[PDB]
Amino acid sequence: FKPRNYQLELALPAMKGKNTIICAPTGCGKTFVSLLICEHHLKKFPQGQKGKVVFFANQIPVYEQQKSVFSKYFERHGYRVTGISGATAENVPVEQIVENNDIIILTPQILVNNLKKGTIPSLSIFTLMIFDECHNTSKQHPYNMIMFNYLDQKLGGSSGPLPQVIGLTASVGVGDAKNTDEALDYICKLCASLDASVIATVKHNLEELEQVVYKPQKFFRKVESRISDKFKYIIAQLMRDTESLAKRICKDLENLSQIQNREFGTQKYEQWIVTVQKACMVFQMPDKDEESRICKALFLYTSHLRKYNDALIISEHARMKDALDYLKDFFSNVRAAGFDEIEQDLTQRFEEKLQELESVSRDPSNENPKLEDLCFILQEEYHLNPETITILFVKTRALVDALKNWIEGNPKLSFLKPGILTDHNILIATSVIAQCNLVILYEYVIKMIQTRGRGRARGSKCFLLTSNAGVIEKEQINMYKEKMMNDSILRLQTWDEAVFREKILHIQTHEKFIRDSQEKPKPVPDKENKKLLCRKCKALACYTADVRVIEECHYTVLGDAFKECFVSRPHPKPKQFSSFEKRAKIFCARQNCSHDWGIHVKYKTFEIPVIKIESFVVEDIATGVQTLYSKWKDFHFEKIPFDPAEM
Amino acid sequence: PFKPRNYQLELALPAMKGKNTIICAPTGCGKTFVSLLICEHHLKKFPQGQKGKVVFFANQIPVYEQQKSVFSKYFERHGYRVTGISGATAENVPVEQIVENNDIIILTPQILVNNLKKGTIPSLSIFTLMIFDECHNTSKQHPYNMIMFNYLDQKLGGSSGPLPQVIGLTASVGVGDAKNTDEALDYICKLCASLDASVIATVKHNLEELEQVVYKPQKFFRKVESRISDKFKYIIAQLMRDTESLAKRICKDLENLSQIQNREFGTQKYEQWIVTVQKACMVFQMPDKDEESRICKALFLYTSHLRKYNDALIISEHARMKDALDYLKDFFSNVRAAGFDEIEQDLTQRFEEKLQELESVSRDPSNENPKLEDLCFILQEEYHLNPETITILFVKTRALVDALKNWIEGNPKLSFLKPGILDHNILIATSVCNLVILYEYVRGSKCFLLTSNAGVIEKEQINMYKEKMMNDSILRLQTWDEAVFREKILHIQTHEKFIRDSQEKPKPVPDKENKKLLCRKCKALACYTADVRVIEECHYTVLGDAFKECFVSRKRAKIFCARQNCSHDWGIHVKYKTFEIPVIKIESFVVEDIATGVQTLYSKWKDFHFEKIPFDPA
Amino acid sequence: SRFAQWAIHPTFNLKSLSCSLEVSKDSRTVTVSHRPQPYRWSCERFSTSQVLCSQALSSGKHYWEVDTRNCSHWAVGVASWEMSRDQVLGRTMDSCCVEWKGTSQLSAWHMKETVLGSDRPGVVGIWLNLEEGKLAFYSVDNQEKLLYECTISASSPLYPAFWLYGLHPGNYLIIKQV
Amino acid sequence: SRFAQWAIHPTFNLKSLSCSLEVSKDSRTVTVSHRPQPYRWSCERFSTSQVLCSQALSSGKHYWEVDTRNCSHWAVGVASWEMSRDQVLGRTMDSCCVEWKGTSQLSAWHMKETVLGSDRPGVVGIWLNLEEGKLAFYSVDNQEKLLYECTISASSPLYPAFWLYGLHPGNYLIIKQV
RNA sequence: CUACAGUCGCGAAACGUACGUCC
RNA sequence: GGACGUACGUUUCGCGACUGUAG
Ligand SMILES: [Zn+2]
Ligand SMILES: [Zn+2]
C-alpha cells in the first residue's frame, strides 16, 4: 500500500525501460517491487494502447499466491488479471485468454508447449515479461527455452516490438567458478542469456535492508561415527552369503563390472549392484525356460543385496532400529507378494539371524553419536529458552520419518512435536518459513536461503552436523563464493552501458551459433520389427509394431494379445497431467513376476496401457540379441502415431 | 592415545631448536609421529596475536589421504584447522583462501608449483614450516626442487621477509652413482644444500632401542642357471633368421641403416636394433609413390613381427613357454583379423606350420623353467616349515606378474595359495610380512634373490658397499662444525643458482612452412599441417572435409586408416562441449615437408613445431 | 572473607561430570571444550552441562562462592544425588535453583516460575543451613542482598549442581574464595 | 643295543636323491651344500628335501639308529612307499613321522596337528614291528621310553624316510652302528 | 637416446542413484 | 508416463610434466 525507499531504489532502473536482474533478499520485497514496476508500466501508454505484462511463476503455490495478490490489487483499476496452470489449460483455449487479459500469470511450460504448437506465434504480443527466481535460466530450463525464442527473434534481424525482459532473483549464483574473474564470466553469461544490461541492488538504503535480512550464524559441529559396528558386521556376513549364493548360478560374475574393490554401505556398492543387475538381464541361453529362472534368481539376489545395502546406509545415518524395521517391512512385503524355492530360502536365511539382530539393535550403548549430540543440542537451546521453533533439514525421504519416529519415544525429548512437511515445535522436512530461529542441517549440503516472509531477522542459529569433513569444507568454500559474488556484482556495476550491451552481444551471438550448429536431424529409423520382453520373467510382452505414440512423448500398445499379459492395480496417488488421469498401475501377469510395467490411463474416452521402456528389454528377432534402452527417445525405431479410428 | 618413544624425542630434538633439518628416521611408521611432534611444538611456540602455518607436501594420493586422516585424528581435538588440497578436489576455491583460513595444509607439491606459477599465492613467506615427505627425491627436476628453486631465489637476491623453517623426512638419503666416501660426501652435501638444511640428525644414543623395533633381515642369493635343450629357441631363431633374410632380400641396405652392429637374439640389444631400423625404414623419399608404400608396408610388417618374436623370446626366457605361446597366438590372431596381405598370410602360414611342433615341445614337464621351479621349491619349503608366513613377491614386468599368477593357478601342488594383484597368502606386486622374495628385481623375515645372470649379485654387493659407504659418509659429515658447513652449502647454492640463471632460454621458432602428414605404416596422404586445429591447446584435431573420407571408425569409437589393408589406428573419436570431432595422435604419423624433401619423424605433439591455429566453430 | 567462614569451597568430580565439560587439573575451573571428548559411559554422565560437587551435608554450616562472570547463561542451585541423570537442573521433584534465562532475567525454579528483577551477579554466594532447608543468595556487599528464599527437604546430602550454556566454546566458570 | 638285534641299517637310493644333498658312497651320511646339484628331471627325482631308503620290507624285524645331532630342522619317519613324487612326506593320511617344527615343539602328523612335548632328541632310533603292532623310539638313556605312539595300516610297502630343511649349508644327518 | 615399470597435474566427456519441480 | 534442475558417487579419454631401472 505504502512503498519504502529500498523498494524504490530497486524499481528505478526498471521504470526507465531497460532490462534488469533486480536481486532483493526480501520475500515480500520481490512482490512489492514487481507490483511497482507492473503499475508504472501500464500507466505510461497513450490512448488505445494496452500493456500485456506476463509474470512467470515456476511453482504452483507461488503461482496461486501471485494470482491472489495481483488480482486483489489490480481490481480497482479494471485490469483483467488471470492465470493458467496445468490444471486449467485443459478444455480452455489459450489464445482467447491472451487477447482478453493484461496481467496473465502463466507457468512457463504452458508457454513453451504453446510455442511448439503454434498458437501465440510470437513473443511480441506481450509488452513486459517478468521472470520470478530468474537464476534457473541456465540450460534447457523452461525459462531458457523461452529466452531462446526471444533471442532468435532479436538476433535474427527480423525483430518487432520486443518486450522488457526484467527478472527478479535473490542470489545471482556463481556456479562452478573459483576466482573473481570466473565469477564475472558466469554472471556475464547469465545476463547475456537473460538479455539484460543493468543489475540493480540496494546501495543507499543498507539500513532498511539490514533490519530485515534474516542473517543467522553458523555453528559447524564435526561428529564421528561409531566404533563397534556389530550391525555392519552381521549384514556384511549376510551379504557375503547372498553373493556366494549368487555365484553358483553365474560363475563369471566378476567379469560383469569394471569397478575396483567394493565395500558395503557406500554408493559405489549400489553402482556395482545396478551394473550387475543390468548385465544379467541380457542372457540369451538356448534353454529359454531355465533362462526364465536364472534371470529371475539373479534379479531376486540383486534386489536383496540392494535392500541390505540401503539398510546399511540408513543405519549409519539414522538410528540402528530403523534399518531392521525397513528390512522387516520389505520382508513382510515379499511375504505378502509370493513364495517360491528362492524366496523361501532367502526369508529363512534372514530369520536365522533376526533374533541376534533384534537383540543387538536394542542396546542402550549403541546409539549413533551424531544422534547423541543432536539430542544434546536440541535439549540445550530449548532449556535455555522454551519458546524456540526449529526446523531439521534431512537429506533423504527415508530418514525424514526415522527421526520422526525417534523423538516419538525419547525420554529427554518429550517437549517436541514432530512437524513433517515434506502446534509444532520442530519441523522435520526434506526441502523447503521465516518464523523459526533455529535451523539444523542434519548432514545436508546455493545455500538453504530462508528469506521468505514479510517479517524480521531477530537472530537465528544454523547448526551443521556431519560425519565427514567434505560436508564442512563445502560450506567453508560456499561462504567464499558468496563473498566473491557481491564483489563481482559491484565490479560489473561500474562499467559503461554502451560497452556492456556490446559485451553481451558477443556471448549472445556465439551461443546462438553454438545452439544452431547442434540442430542435427533425426537418425534413420531402423525398420525391422523387434519385440519387447519383461525384465524379470523375459516373457513375450508385445512386438514393436503394436506400439503407438500419443503426443510424441508417451507410448501405448494397441494389440489384443497384450490384454492378457498384464494385471491392473489401483494407483496410490491419482492425478491429471496435460490430457490424462492416472487410473491404474499395471504389473506382469505371470505367477511371480509382478513387475512394474507402467500406468493405465484415461486419455480421451478410452483406457490405454501407457508403458515405459525403462522396465523392458528390447530384442531383435532377426539375430537374437537383446539390449536395454533406458529412455524412449534413445530406442530408435519406426514410430507410428496413435489413431482413434482403429480402436 | 599412543606413546612417544625416546628416539622419537631425540630425532625431533634438533629441529625444534629452529634449524632447517633432514631427519633420516628408518621406516615403520615412525616418521609420521616425529612430524606430529614437530607440528605440535611449532604451532604452540607462537605468541598470542600471530600464528604459524604448517604445510606438509605429500607425494601420492594414498600417502596424502593417509596423512590427512592421521593429522585430522590427532590435531582436531586441540583446536586447529586441518584441511587438504589435491588434484582429486575439483576446480574450486582459490588456494590463497584455503591457506588463509587453515593451519595444517596437506598439498601435493604440483599444486604449490601451479599456484606459484600464476601468482595466486604471492610467495613462500605465507607459511612458517614446510615439511617434506621423502625428501631424498629432491633432485634434478622433481617438484620439490621447483619449490626449493622458488625458496632459494627468494632468499638470495631480492631479500623478503621471514622464510619458513624447512624439514625433510627421508629414510635413506640414497648416495647412488658414487664410488667412494668422497663422492658420497659431495652428493650428500649437495642434497643438504638443495634443501637449505644444516643438520642430518639421526638416532645415536639408544640405537639398540631402535634395534628392538626394526629387523634388518638376512639374505639368500640364488644363482641358478638356464636351460640347454632350447628347441623353442631353435625354432624361434630359425623363424627370426628367416624373416631377417626376407627383410634383407627386400631392403638390401638393412645392415647399414642401423648402428648397433653385433646383434644377439633375445635381449634389449636386438630390441634397440629393431626399433632403430623401424625408425630408419619409414624415412624414404623416392619418385615412386606406390613403391614407397609397398616397401614401407612390407618393412613394417616384417619388423613388427621381428619385434614381437624378440619380445616373445625375452618373455619365454623368464617365464613358462605357455605364456609366450598364448602371447604369440593372440598376437597372430589379432593381426590376421587386422588386414590381409600375402606378406601377412606368408608369415602366419610360416608360424602355423611350426605351431604344433612348438606346442608339442613346450607342454613337456621335463622342459621346466629352472628359476621358476626353484621358486616353487623355496615356496613349499618355507610354507611347510611355517604355514603362517606370507610372501609379497616382486617381479619386474606386469606381463610376468600375470603370467606367474597363471602359473600359480596352473600348479596343482600349490592348491593352498591365493595370489594378489597390485585374506591372502601371496602377493605379486611390481614396484610398489615374513618373506620378501625378489624374482629378479634390481621377526622371522628372510629375503631371497633369484637370478639367471651372475653379476646382479655383484650389483647387490656393490649396493651393500654403497649402504655402508652412505652410513660412513653421514657419520663423517655429522661430526663437522656448523659454520664452515653453512658457508660450504651457501657457496654450493650460489654456484647452482649461477648455473641456473645462464642457459635457461630454450625458446624455439614456430615454422610457417606448410607440410603434409602421411600414415606411419602405408605412407598415404592424410592431411596438411595448415588444416589441423588445436582446441584448448591440448586436443589436436583435423577440421577438414577431405579428412572425413580418409579414416574408418570401428570407450568410444577408435578410428583407423581408410586404406585397403592398413588397419593403423590414428586417434580416437571424442566429444567436445557440443561437437564430435576426432582427435589424432602424432605417434602414428610421418611428417613430410612440402618445401624440402625430408620425411622427418616425431614422437609427441610438443616437439613437432608449426603455427598452431586455434579451433573455432565458425 | 566478609562474614564468618562457614564452608570450604567445592570441587567438580570427574566421574559424574557430563561429557561436554573440561574442568582443569586443579578441578575448580569449569569450561566448555571446543569439541566434545570421549569419556566413560555409565549411569553417572549427565549428557547435558550439569556437574555436581563432593561436599557432604552438615548440620547448618554451608556457604559457597564461585565466579559466574563471563558465562553466557548459567543456573546455580542444589540437587540430590538420587536423581536421574537425564533430568534438568531445577525441573526435578526436589532440586531448587536460580536461572539466568535468555531474556536477561534472573528467575528461580523450585519443583514453579518465581522470578527476580533484571539483576546479573558477577559474584553471588548461596547460604545454606542444612538442618532446616533455608537459602539466601547474597550477591556482593549490598546489605546481604539475597532476594529469594527456598525451602529444602533435608532428606539427602546436598551436592550443589551447576549448569551453564554449553554451545559456546571457551565459556567458563571458576570457583573462588568465599 | 642292550637287547637282541633284529635287523640292519637301511641304505639310500641314488635314484630318488634330493637336488641339494651330497650323500656319499657310504649311503648313510647326508650332506647339504649351497648350490643345487644338476641332475636328470623325471617322475622319480624328488626335487624336494625328502630322503628315502632302499630296504625291502619284512614281517616284524626292523631296527636302526640315526645320529640327529648337528641339525636344526629335521623330520624322520616311516610311511608308505607308493605315493606321488610331487607330494611331500607328512601330509598323507598314512604316515608315522615326527615333524620337529621351527616353533620349538616336537610335533607329529597323523592327518591332525598331533603335537607332543618339548624334548630335543639326541639320537633317534626307529624301531618298527609291522607284525606285532608295537612302535618304539628310544632316544637317550631314559629307561627306553618310546615318547610317540602310532597305529599302522600294515597293508602297504613301509620304506623308511627322512626330511630336513637343508638351507643351512653343512647340515648333516648320519647313521651309526648299534 | 631406446625400451621398461611407478607417479603427479591440467582440460573434455559419459553413467548410476537419490532429491525437488513441472507438464 | 514424460521433461527439467540440483546434490553425491563412479568410470572413460586427450594433453603435458617428473623420478627410477637396464642398455
Ligand atoms: Zn514377467
Ligand atoms: Zn595408413
Author numbering:
A (entry chain A): 241 to 662, 690 to 699, 706 to 718, 722 to 923
B (entry chain C): 240 to 661, 690 to 699, 709 to 718, 734 to 845, 858 to 921
C (entry chain B), D (entry chain D): 252 to 362, 364 to 430
From the paper:
RIG-I is an essential innate immune receptor that responds to infection by RNA viruses. The RIG-I signaling cascade is mediated by a series of post-translational modifications, the most important of which is ubiquitination of the RIG-I Caspase Recruitment Domains (CARDs) by E3 ligase Riplet. Riplet is a homodimer composed of an N-terminal RING domain (catalytic domain), CC domain (coiled-coil domain, homodimerization), and C-terminal PrySpry domain (RIG-I recognition domain). Each structure contains two RIG-I molecules, one p3dsRNA24, and one Riplet homodimer, but they differ in the relative positions of two PrySpry domains, which depend on the relative positions of their partner RIG-I molecules.
In the structure composed of the smallest population of particles (6.5%), the second RIG-I is not bound at the opposite terminus at all, but instead binds to a proximal internal duplex site. This results in a head-to-tail arrangement between bound Riplet molecules. Like other internally-bound structures of RIG-I, the CTD is tilted and its conserved diphosphate recognition pocket has melted to accommodate the RNA backbone. This is an interesting result because it suggests that Riplet forms stabilized complexes in cases where two RIG-I molecules are bound on the same RNA, even if there is only one triphosphate end (such as a blunt dsRNA replication intermediate > 20 bp in size). Importantly, we observe that the relative position between the RIG-I molecules is not very important due to flexibility of the Riplet linkers. As the second RIG-I in each structure recognizes different types of RNA sites, the two PrySpry domains bind to RIG-I from different approach angles, revealing variable distances between them, ranging from 58 Å to 101 Å. This finding suggests that the CC domains in these complexes are more dynamic than expected (consistent with our inability to visualize them), enabling the complex to accommodate different spacings between sites of PrySpry domains, and enabling PrySpry domains to approach RIG-I Hel2 from different angles. Despite the different relative orientations of PrySpry in the three structures, the PrySpry domain uses the same interface with RIG-I Hel2 in each case.
